[PDB]
């Protein structure tokens, strides 16, 4: 008991050396596995029932998982670095008092572009991706809510709507975008841009940074309205057997030196205030990472849609298969 840790997380977030460092420091063996979406993560947790000590839902999955009895309360007294978290990302309606989730990584989705292949000025909004000149050229995220977000935004509806008529209208709008889609990828989304397989599409800010670090000129165009904002938080599943190891890992990741070093490797902003302050000005002021105020004001955080989540999934699965 507590000699091991079963940790299920998003791909790309934790460098292999960081898990090695945790095991060296604690003596705790990490059985690590990854997912590319909340929907894939959730389906595995449902089939398995238990077998996990840590899971990393986006904030729009936290209330759903709590209500379904999938999570357990996190003890802040076991987290010495809880005080290092930015208060602006804490105590939100999805999880009052952070009883079930700890902010871990926040990011945004914009339009990824290869500045050696295409023109930046020719795209300002999500709707521009529908232009016939993009036939068989785009990468979309493999994520129901993000793909629906861009179509709902184009239609002038809330990207967090629970109106079935609006979700259906977004589905019909997305059917018109499908001739422009080459691939759906949320597992290693910078790779099609790095390989020259795609020169445009949706892209996470961190992934575009990862691409630039490798040499590819992959920038982010922030849509004028409807830029996607999201946050991933760490949670402890209800059936977790290694609760002490779980808190030790959360605290290890919250450690400002760790959160800052990792952020520079992965290209994502951090909700750990003390770590954010350790980041260089070059990173903190990078326009392809941190969106401008106008983009913030006109964008939307991904929020819960309660029972309408099944409609989003049903239609998104149809888009991918058809």
Automatic annotation (TrEMBL):
PANTHER family: SPERMIDINE/PUTRESCINE-BINDING PERIPLASMIC PROTEIN (PTHR30222), SPERMIDINE_PUTRESCINE-BINDING PERIPLASMIC PROTEIN (PTHR30222:SF17). GO terms for cellular component: outer membrane-bounded periplasmic space. Belongs to the bacterial solute-binding protein PotD/PotF family. Required for the activity of the bacterial periplasmic transport system of putrescine and spermidine. Polyamine binding protein. The keyword Transport applies. InterPro entries: SBP, Sperm_putr-bd. GO terms for biological process: putrescine transport. Its main location: periplasm. Spermidine binds at residues 12, 60, 143-146, 302. It is found in: Periplasm. The keyword Glycoprotein does not apply. GO terms for molecular function: putrescine binding; spermidine binding. It comes from the Bacteria. This is Putrescine-binding periplasmic protein. Keywords: Periplasm, Signal, Transport.
């Amino acid at each position: 008991k507590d000699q091991e840790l079963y940790f299920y997380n998003w791909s790309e977030y934790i460098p292999s050396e960081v898990l090695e460092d945790f095991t060296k420091e604690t003596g705790i063996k990490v059985i690590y596995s990854t997912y590319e979406s909340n929907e894939s993560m959730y389906a595995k947790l449902k089939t398995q029932g238990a077998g996990y000590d840590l899971v990393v839902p986006s904030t729009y999955f936290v209330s759903k998982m709590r209500k379904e009895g999938m999570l357990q309360e996190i003890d802040h007294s076991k987290l010495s670095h809880f005080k290092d978290l930015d208060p602006n990302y804490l105590n939100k309606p999805f999880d009052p008092g952070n009883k079930f989730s700890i902010p871990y990584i926040w990011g945004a989705t914009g339009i990824g572009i290869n500045t050696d292949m295409l023109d930046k000025k020719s795209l300002k909004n999500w709707g521009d991706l529908w232009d016939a000149k993009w036939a068989g050229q785009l990468m979309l995220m493999d994520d129901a809510r993000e793909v629906f977000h861009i179509a709902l935004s184009k239609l002038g509806y809330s990207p967090n709507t629970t109106n079935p008529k609006e979700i259906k209208a977004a589905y019909r709008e997305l059917k018109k975008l499908m001739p422009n889609v080459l691939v759906f990828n949320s597992d290693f989304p910078a790779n099609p841009y790095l390989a020259g397989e795609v020169s445009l599409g949706m892209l996470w800010n961190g992934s575009a940074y990862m691409a630039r670090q490798e040499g590819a000129p992959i920038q982010i165009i922030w849509p004028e309205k409807g830029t996607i904002f999201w946050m991933d938080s760490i949670s402890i599943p209800a059936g977790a057997k290694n609760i002490e190891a779980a808190h030790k890992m959360i605290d290890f990741l919250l450690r400002p030196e760790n959160a800052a070093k990792i952020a520079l490797e992965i290209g994502y902003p951090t909700p750990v205030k003390t770590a954010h302050d350790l980041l260089p000005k070059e990173f903190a002021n990078d326009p392809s990472i941190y969106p401008p105020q106008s983009v913030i004001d006109n964008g939307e955080w991904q929020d819960e849609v309660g029972e309408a989540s099944v409609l989003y999934d049903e239609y998104f699965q149809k888009l991918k298969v058809n």
